[PDB]
Symmetry: C2
Subunit: 99 residues, 2 copies
Amino acid sequence: GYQKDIDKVYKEQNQMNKIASKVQNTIKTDIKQEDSNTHVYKDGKVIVIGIQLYKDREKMYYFAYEIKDGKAEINREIDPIKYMKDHKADYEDENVEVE
Amino acid sequence: GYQKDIDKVYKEQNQMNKIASKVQNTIKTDIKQEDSNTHVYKDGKVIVIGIQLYKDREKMYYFAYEIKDGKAEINREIDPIKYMKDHKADYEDENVE
């Protein structure tokens, strides 16, 4: 299953957000999968998350990660919106519906 | 002098901005002292920098650092604007009015 790797993604996201919050303190640092959107592609090679990046905004912000050599690495060269449009997910955990 | 410690502060700010820019890509990276304002206080114990934090804003954003055990450590509990008002700087390098 994909949960071990999803956990890596959320750990990495929180680690980066914690550092980011030192220089831009509106960044949320307690990102939780059950309050986010998660999709897995290419049998675990790409994971796209949508999260509440800012403590004072409801908006979802999306990020694409690659799982390479057992580690979650963000890849801002991947357009996550386009990626979700263009590929069939192997897994979805959609907790935020935005009309 | 204070240049060794000012350099440690800019190095640290740049390391944080690099990571920050991965999640919020308007954060500017590779900030240079010559494009920023720097003030040193307390014989080098506290260093306050004013930088162009955002690629999409001209505005200067300020951050206070402490030098402890030879390391530069950001301290967000210090209000840097007030700190500069209330202390006499030992050194200044002001490049933005």
